Amino acid sequence: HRPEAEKWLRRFERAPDARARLVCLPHAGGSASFFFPLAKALAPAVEVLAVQYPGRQDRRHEPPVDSIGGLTNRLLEVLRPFGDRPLALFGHSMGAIIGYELALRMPEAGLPAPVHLFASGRRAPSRYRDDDVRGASDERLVAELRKLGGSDAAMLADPELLAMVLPAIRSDYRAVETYRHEPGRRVDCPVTVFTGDHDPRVSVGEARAWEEHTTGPADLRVLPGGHFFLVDQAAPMIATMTEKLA
């Protein structure tokens, strides 16, 4: 079971004396490797556990888990062994939703409550939007990922890997857009929200609205950029996260 569980997590920089572990949950089309710089930046005080969803990179042959709830169910089991220190969650876009669902479910699932939720690039769970005004073409979604460079973009360049990963991007996209929150629910931990100032799917009001999803303090940081603002704006985010986790 642990060997299977370990397929879901990558520890790019062991931090045996970390005061907290930070579970990092990528966007649609994003893999664990997205958080390699963050693991290096937060160690030794915080240990990053970067989540590898089925269908990603080394898991490319596994069918995507097709719903937020299915991902959450599986991740709850993955995170069982980390109750010896505080656990915090960070997610971008789809990852933000999975982070929120994990935080809500953890106590009834038998896991200690998380100490903090960082929600990046995502409107509050209660905030509804109809279909993207831009549509969601294969070309746009792949182009956004290509722009980021790194390992995920390198994969997309190979037409054989592209053919396999495109349906995973599509599955992820559909999972997030079909996701519906359970009305009335609130986590108990602090929520710190990061959003780009021109992400067309996250208004400042929708980002502030994360306050309706916690009984604890909610914080909002608007950073310059679009949906993937967090790449170019990594430093102040890391600074804020370090401060919050200290």
Query: Residues 93, 120, 171, 203: which is the catalytic one?
Result: 93
Quick one: which segment of 28-36, 45-53, 82-90, 221-229 binds Cl ion (CB under 5 A)? 28-36
Tell me, residue by residue from 37 to 76, as one string, x for binding to Cl ion by CB under 5 A and - for no binding. ----------------------------------------
The answer to whether 171 is a known catalytic residue is no
Minimum distance of Cl ion from residue 108's CB (angstroms)? 26
DSSP codes, 80-101 = GGGTTS-EEEEEETHHHHHHHH
Sheet strands side by side (includes 87-92) = 9-10, 46-51, 20-25, 87-92, 116-120, 191-196, 218-223
Q: By CB under 5 A, is residue 230 in contact with Cl ion? A: no
Pairing of strands 20-25, 87-92: parallel
Interface residue with Cl ion, options 10, 22, 23, 27 (CB under 5 A): 27
Contact between 11 and 78 under an 8 Å Cβ cutoff? The reply is: no
Minimum distance of Cl ion from residue 120's CB (angstroms)? 11
Contact between 56 and 25 under an 8 Å Cβ cutoff? The reply is: no
- Kindly tell me which of 94 and 193 has the beta carbon lying closer to Cl ion: 94
Q: Within positions 78 to 107, which residues make up the interface with Cl ion, using CB under 5 A? A: 93-94
To 5 degrees, how large is the angle CA 11–CA 14–CA 15? 125
Q: Would you name the residues annotated as active-site residues?
A: 93
